[PDB]
Write a protein that binds this DNA or RNA. Structure first.
Ligand SMILES: [Mg+2]
Ligand SMILES: [Mg+2]
Ligand SMILES: [Mg+2]
Ligand SMILES: [Mg+2]
Ligand SMILES: [Mg+2]
Ligand SMILES: [Mg+2]
Ligand SMILES: [Mg+2]
Ligand SMILES: [Mg+2]
Ligand SMILES: [Mg+2]
Ligand SMILES: [Mg+2]
Ligand SMILES: [Mg+2]
Ligand SMILES: [Mg+2]
Ligand SMILES: [Mg+2]
Ligand SMILES: [Mg+2]
Ligand SMILES: [Mg+2]
Ligand SMILES: [Mg+2]
Ligand SMILES: [Mg+2]
Ligand SMILES: [Mg+2]
Ligand SMILES: [Mg+2]
Ligand SMILES: [Mg+2]
Ligand SMILES: [Mg+2]
Ligand SMILES: [Mg+2]
Ligand SMILES: [Mg+2]
Ligand SMILES: [Mg+2]
Ligand SMILES: [Mg+2]
Ligand SMILES: [Mg+2]
Ligand SMILES: [Mg+2]
Ligand SMILES: [Mg+2]
Ligand SMILES: [Mg+2]
Ligand SMILES: [Mg+2]
Ligand SMILES: [Mg+2]
Ligand SMILES: [Mg+2]
Ligand SMILES: [Mg+2]
Ligand SMILES: [Mg+2]
Ligand SMILES: [Mg+2]
Ligand SMILES: [Mg+2]
Ligand SMILES: [Mg+2]
Ligand SMILES: [Mg+2]
Ligand SMILES: [Mg+2]
Ligand SMILES: [Mg+2]
Ligand SMILES: [Mg+2]
Ligand SMILES: [Mg+2]
Ligand SMILES: [Mg+2]
Ligand SMILES: [Mg+2]
Ligand SMILES: [Mg+2]
Ligand SMILES: [Mg+2]
Ligand SMILES: [Mg+2]
Ligand SMILES: [Mg+2]
Ligand SMILES: [Mg+2]
Ligand SMILES: [Mg+2]
Ligand SMILES: [Mg+2]
Ligand SMILES: [Mg+2]
Ligand SMILES: [Mg+2]
Ligand SMILES: [Mg+2]
Ligand SMILES: [Mg+2]
Ligand SMILES: [Mg+2]
Ligand SMILES: [Mg+2]
Ligand SMILES: [Mg+2]
Ligand SMILES: [Mg+2]
Ligand SMILES: [Mg+2]
Ligand SMILES: [Mg+2]
Ligand SMILES: [Mg+2]
Ligand SMILES: [Mg+2]
Ligand SMILES: [Mg+2]
Ligand SMILES: [Mg+2]
Ligand SMILES: [Mg+2]
Ligand SMILES: [Mg+2]
Ligand SMILES: [Mg+2]
Ligand SMILES: [Mg+2]
Ligand SMILES: [Mg+2]
Ligand SMILES: [Mg+2]
Ligand SMILES: [Mg+2]
Ligand SMILES: [Mg+2]
Ligand SMILES: [Mg+2]
Ligand SMILES: [Mg+2]
Ligand SMILES: [Mg+2]
Ligand SMILES: [Mg+2]
Ligand SMILES: [Mg+2]
Ligand SMILES: [Mg+2]
Ligand SMILES: [Mg+2]
Ligand SMILES: [Mg+2]
Ligand SMILES: [Mg+2]
Ligand SMILES: [Mg+2]
Ligand SMILES: [Mg+2]
Ligand SMILES: [Mg+2]
Ligand SMILES: [Mg+2]
Ligand SMILES: [Mg+2]
Ligand SMILES: [Mg+2]
Ligand SMILES: [Mg+2]
Ligand SMILES: [Mg+2]
Ligand SMILES: [Mg+2]
Ligand SMILES: [Mg+2]
Lengths: 77, 22, 59
RNA sequence: GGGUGGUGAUGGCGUGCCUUUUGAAGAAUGAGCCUGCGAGUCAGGGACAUGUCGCAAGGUUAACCCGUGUGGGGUAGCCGCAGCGAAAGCGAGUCUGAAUAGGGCGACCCACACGCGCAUACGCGCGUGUGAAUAGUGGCGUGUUCUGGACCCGAA
RNA sequence: GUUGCGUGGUUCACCGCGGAGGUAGAGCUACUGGAUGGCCGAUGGGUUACUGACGUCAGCCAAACUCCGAAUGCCGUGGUGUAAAGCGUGGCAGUGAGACGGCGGGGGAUAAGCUCCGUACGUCGAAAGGGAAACAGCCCAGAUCGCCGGCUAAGGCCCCCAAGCGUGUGCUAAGUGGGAAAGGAUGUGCAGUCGCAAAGACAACCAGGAGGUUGGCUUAGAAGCAGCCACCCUUGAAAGAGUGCGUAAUAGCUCACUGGUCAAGUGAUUGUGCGCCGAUAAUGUAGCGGGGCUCAAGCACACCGCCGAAGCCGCGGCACAUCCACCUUGUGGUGGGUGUGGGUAGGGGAGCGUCCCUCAUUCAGCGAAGCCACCGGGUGACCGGUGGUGGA
RNA sequence: UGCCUCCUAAAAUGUAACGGAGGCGCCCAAAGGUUCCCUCAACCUGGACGGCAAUCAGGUGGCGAGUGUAAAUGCACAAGGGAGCUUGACUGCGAGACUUACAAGUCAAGCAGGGACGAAAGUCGGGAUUAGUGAUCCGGCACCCCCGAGUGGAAGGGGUGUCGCUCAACGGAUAAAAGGUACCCCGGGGAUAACAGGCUGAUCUUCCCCAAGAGUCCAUAUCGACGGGAUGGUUUGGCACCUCGAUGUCGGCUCGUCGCAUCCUGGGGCUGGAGCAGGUCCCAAGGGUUGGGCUGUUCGCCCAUUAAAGCGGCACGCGAGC
RNA sequence: UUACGGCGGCCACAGCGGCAGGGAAACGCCCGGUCCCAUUCCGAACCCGGAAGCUAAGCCUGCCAGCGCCGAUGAUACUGCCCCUCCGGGUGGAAAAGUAGGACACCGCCGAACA
């Protein structure tokens, strides 16, 4: 038969996506949304990360918002 | 194919409610 | 005001949420009955397990 | 008439047992029958965990010695007693480090009571004590494990 | 999974609140592609019947399209509820061949009792009982034990077979019910939509239904009629170089179109309920389980009962977990609650029986063991008594 | 066969198939850091060589361009374009997270040292992000002087940094490895093939629906294309459900038995049926349905006949019957 | 308080475009490049020095739905959970598109005159 296994490979699922949702209390350094590119943008008190990870600079509550079209994640202390 | 069809059709009894193993 | 819920169908074959909602009302077996206040939480529970119980506004 | 014990016309229900399987009454395996026999055992101061008992900041001996014995000796040793570090080393600290930076590992050991250096009588610390599970240690029981054939049988 | 030691509501359910989404769907002049029909028109092609870029007007399509976009699900949080939630850490596991059914998908031929995933989906596995004729995986329902009590579930109630040859209103003629497609069909019941008509409707009948424009031509004749083709007017109730037969034609039997003639509906047409045909493999009716059933025992709707399980309730026995009150208030007992008690792998707990040893005690030649029979007993392994046999 | 990206994937995460698509085993001394500046493609208009498309000018143009490299997510605020200076492509760390069986993998504010750029604020522990990789062992090299087998050394070892595997079957059995067995053996499996059964019915088979046509005219005497719907379960398959502590495989012989989709005989309708013969369809399974040549054959062809030399099922009926 | 100047919130209901009107301070264009700084050429820009000129443009105001944008209600699609042979039905949610319409933004912090 035809050896049509020309496409049978894939990479590992990288477990992307939002890790801490709105109104959820987090500590500083705790990653909020791990993603490719800037699907979400760092808001107030949120750092970006070398691989666009959007961590918390400070403890407090996660909140999502819009900043001139760009959708952003911030922490309110 | 008759045996297969008859077995398949006997799900359509009230006691079976349209559902039956295999 | 004050609802009166009787379990009439088995939990055999019921989903997680139905079994746990019957547990939350405190229903244990067929023709068990419990009395609970008619609040939003109770009506949500009853809505989840509507087909397994009958309810009446019994004092 | 009633109750035992035997039988059982007649009516209903009713697909052996084991193994192994998604699933066997299975037309998958094994078993003719009976009687007898036939499979997680033992050793070790082994290892881990537990139950229990002794002693307890200690515990315990090994060989061996002496005893008619299972008893009495026997401190060599082992475990506990301080940790950190590759190590030198330092030590309730220590390692990394330039760091009176941060981190890693480690110490702040228990319940009840008294006693103090004393808070009006109620308490921090530190000491007796009493745990005769304290905290370990030794014995004994159990489960698991290690090395042995290691639950038993079976090749080519 | 179990079990020990900790922790304690952290689990889970429901309600509310705060959040991310790109599935379903949809949309696409919002992108990338696919793609239908118009209109204009760059080009190309042989001045331009050919091409028709781009636009423009509309209608569409997509797992790897998205200007959009749910329901669910998920994360957090606050209340409420819920005993046998959760979590940590140890001891001991087994399992790591799954099956089918529902829902969403891939592979396949949108085949497979196929295969591969998803699914706080189910059941079987490891689940007995009831229903499905029989029938792991469907429906009902989770068996602690006993009862010659009751109520129900699914499913049923003419006989097999417990309960209705139940009641009311209709439908079916096919044994449809009690298998099947494209499609065929003046079957039948019901709900609609138009034409004509007492100024006489449809069916049936007499009279009548033609002349020049019988052009093109095939040709023996095309003259409507072997075929394609003029593509229109007029004495007249109406009336075509003509609806179907038919000949080489000429011809011939008639239908379109009305009058009189006879006295009440008659034609089309749509959706539907129940039917018909299509229908068709090999041991024997063999596609209601059987008898039988339309005088329904079939179907639809409405209603009334009843039967029906190991479900629930009643009465009694047992057990496990946990809680509350008395007794040396934890070694724990007693009483009473509440909950629970299907189970394979497997975990934990507690026991029966055999033999041997030690200690104590007690039987035994007036008869032990072993064996046999009978009568009794315990929740189980099993136990006791009596007698027979027997001989330590 | 490892890694990366997408879809499948059912709007968290995750999710399989020998499902659908592609990439990677690098590159860059700037394509890194920082500071500052800029905006693209396409279209339209005009313009020596120059044209559709080189450079120029003006408009329009918010992203249709570009991004080192696949895809996705991003990026016009730019992460895209350009320029200046630089080496943070740091050392000592690291609260807290993500992910995860483990091993791994990933993010990280912030502190210190010493720097880069910047006027400062600040940013910089490589690159828009996610591939460009390899555990442990055993060794090598540089440094530190930690240990230094009586002592001083030294050898050797240790630490810190780093190097050596298409170990690519990419969690990496050995440093080191191909085949045959029909001479085969053993342990197993119906966990898995060959026969037969079962499901399916693509294929096969037998019909049917529609009717473009063919038939002088005329679709329907007969034949019917393009398409459509089914039957059967006799073909070749698909699946792998019973059987591997055995279900004997083809053909023949013998004996049958059943279906009817009928070969003959029987009864009919239509005919492009004058008659004789036929064609087609319908009904019909009671009986019959030959002997040879060739081939293991089934099948098939042939010979001679015949009323006819039917087609199938029954473990492709039948080896405890041959 | 103004047809003014000043910096943000917000990122189209705000944008873009069209048509008018506005110059007190201010924003601007504007005049130059001896003077810091600058052009991968250009004093265009950037930067510096000025106030002869002007609201032509930017900017501001007002009006326009034109190009866009926002957009219900209802209905439908889809759907959780039930009931049920599908068809279906109950119940809880509920789009996209389209329509009615909305809309030429709104809000916040100092100076000039006024006052
Ligand atoms: Mg991926
Ligand atoms: Mg990086
Ligand atoms: Mg099993
Ligand atoms: Mg099997
Ligand atoms: Mg057997
Ligand atoms: Mg048998
Ligand atoms: Mg076997
Ligand atoms: Mg046997
Ligand atoms: Mg050490
Ligand atoms: Mg420290
Ligand atoms: Mg002790
Ligand atoms: Mg022992
Ligand atoms: Mg062996
Ligand atoms: Mg455990
Ligand atoms: Mg919400
Ligand atoms: Mg949502
Ligand atoms: Mg997608
Ligand atoms: Mg869709
Ligand atoms: Mg397009
Ligand atoms: Mg077109
Ligand atoms: Mg989509
Ligand atoms: Mg395995
Ligand atoms: Mg597996
Ligand atoms: Mg599976
Ligand atoms: Mg499916
Ligand atoms: Mg299967
Ligand atoms: Mg499933
Ligand atoms: Mg059952
Ligand atoms: Mg049953
Ligand atoms: Mg039965
Ligand atoms: Mg009753
Ligand atoms: Mg009922
Ligand atoms: Mg019976
Ligand atoms: Mg009866
Ligand atoms: Mg009835
Ligand atoms: Mg009657
Ligand atoms: Mg009746
Ligand atoms: Mg019938
Ligand atoms: Mg029938
Ligand atoms: Mg039919
Ligand atoms: Mg039939
Ligand atoms: Mg019960
Ligand atoms: Mg039990
Ligand atoms: Mg039970
Ligand atoms: Mg067990
Ligand atoms: Mg004697
Ligand atoms: Mg005697
Ligand atoms: Mg004895
Ligand atoms: Mg006895
Ligand atoms: Mg006796
Ligand atoms: Mg005796
Ligand atoms: Mg996902
Ligand atoms: Mg999902
Ligand atoms: Mg490749
Ligand atoms: Mg650079
Ligand atoms: Mg750039
Ligand atoms: Mg480097
Ligand atoms: Mg850390
Ligand atoms: Mg510094
Ligand atoms: Mg400087
Ligand atoms: Mg940093
Ligand atoms: Mg890159
Ligand atoms: Mg090695
Ligand atoms: Mg030396
Ligand atoms: Mg020496
Ligand atoms: Mg050296
Ligand atoms: Mg280091
Ligand atoms: Mg591997
Ligand atoms: Mg190796
Ligand atoms: Mg040979
Ligand atoms: Mg063998
Ligand atoms: Mg099999
Ligand atoms: Mg086969
Ligand atoms: Mg068989
Ligand atoms: Mg078939
Ligand atoms: Mg399978
Ligand atoms: Mg056998
Ligand atoms: Mg026939
Ligand atoms: Mg004939
Ligand atoms: Mg015959
Ligand atoms: Mg006869
Ligand atoms: Mg011869
Ligand atoms: Mg035959
Ligand atoms: Mg055969
Ligand atoms: Mg045969
Ligand atoms: Mg044979
Ligand atoms: Mg035979
Ligand atoms: Mg002025
Ligand atoms: Mg100038
Ligand atoms: Mg003006
Ligand atoms: Mg709406
Ligand atoms: Mg809308």
């Amino acid at each position: 038969g035809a050896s049509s296994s020309r496409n049978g490979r894939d990479s590992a699922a990288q477990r992307l996506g939002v890790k801490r949702y709105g109104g959820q209390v987090v500590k500083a350094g705790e990653i909020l949304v791990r993603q490719r590119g800037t699907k979400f943008h760092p808001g107030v008190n949120v750092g970006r990360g070398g691989d666009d990870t959007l961590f918390a600079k400070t403890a407090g509550a996660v909140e999502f918002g819009i900043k001139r079209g760009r959708k952003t994640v911030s922490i309110v202390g | 194919a008759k045996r297969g069809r008859k077995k398949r059709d006997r799900k359509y009894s009230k006691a079976n409610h349209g559902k039956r193993p295999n | 005001s004050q609802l009166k819920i009787t379990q009439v169908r088995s939990t055999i074959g019921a989903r997680w949420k139905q079994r746990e909602s019957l547990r939350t009302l405190g229903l244990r077996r067929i023709r068990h009955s419990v009395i609970r206040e008619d609040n939003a939480a109770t009506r949500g529970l009853i809505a989840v397990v509507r087909h397994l119980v009958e309810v009446e506004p019994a004092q």
